[PDB]
Design a protein around this ligand. Structure first.
Ligand SMILES: [Mg+2]
Ligand SMILES: [Mg+2]
Ligand SMILES: [Mg+2]
Ligand SMILES: [Mg+2]
Length: 85
RNA sequence: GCCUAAAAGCAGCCAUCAAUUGAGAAAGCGUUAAAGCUCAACAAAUUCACCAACAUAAUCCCAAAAACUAAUAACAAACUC
């Protein structure tokens, strides 16, 4: 009762060559890495780092108000920490 | 994600990102651990809503009573006329 024993057989090479965890069935057939001429641009056109900020988003789009609602929930949780019930 | 017999939002430590118009890797109950009951977010309305209240002694309680007819009243000394 643990995880799969197969984990990075040749870590310096195989992991760069392709991903082995995508194959789920017992029949071992690993998929090719599909070089950069296959995936579309939206894969690289997304933030792959730290998220944005409320003092950086513009108050005319929806993600700004989404982050503001998240911060409002956080503030309510911080304030309601003294629930004596 | 680690630790742990188990740590599923909730012994704990670190991150706290991600779709939906909209729901915190979760602010409180609950389970050994789950489950389950709530809170905050949308859609449904919108009275006001922050703190303030706390026992008793011994012979027998201790004037009786009275919320509205006009009050800078009146009655009241060895004071003063
Ligand atoms: Mg959203
Ligand atoms: Mg609610
Ligand atoms: Mg008593
Ligand atoms: Mg007199």
């Amino acid at each position: 009762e643990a995880l799969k024993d197969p984990e990075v057989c040749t870590d310096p090479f195989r992991l760069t060559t392709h991903a082995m965890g995508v194959n789920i069935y017992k029949e071992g057939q690993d998929v090719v890495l599909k070089p950069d001429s296959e995936y579309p641009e939206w894969l690289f056109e997304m933030n792959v780092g730290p998220p944005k900020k409320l003092e950086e988003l513009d108050p005319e789009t929806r993600e700004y108000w989404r982050l503001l609602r998240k911060h409002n929930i956080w503030r309510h949780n911080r304030l309601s920490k003294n629930r004596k019930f």
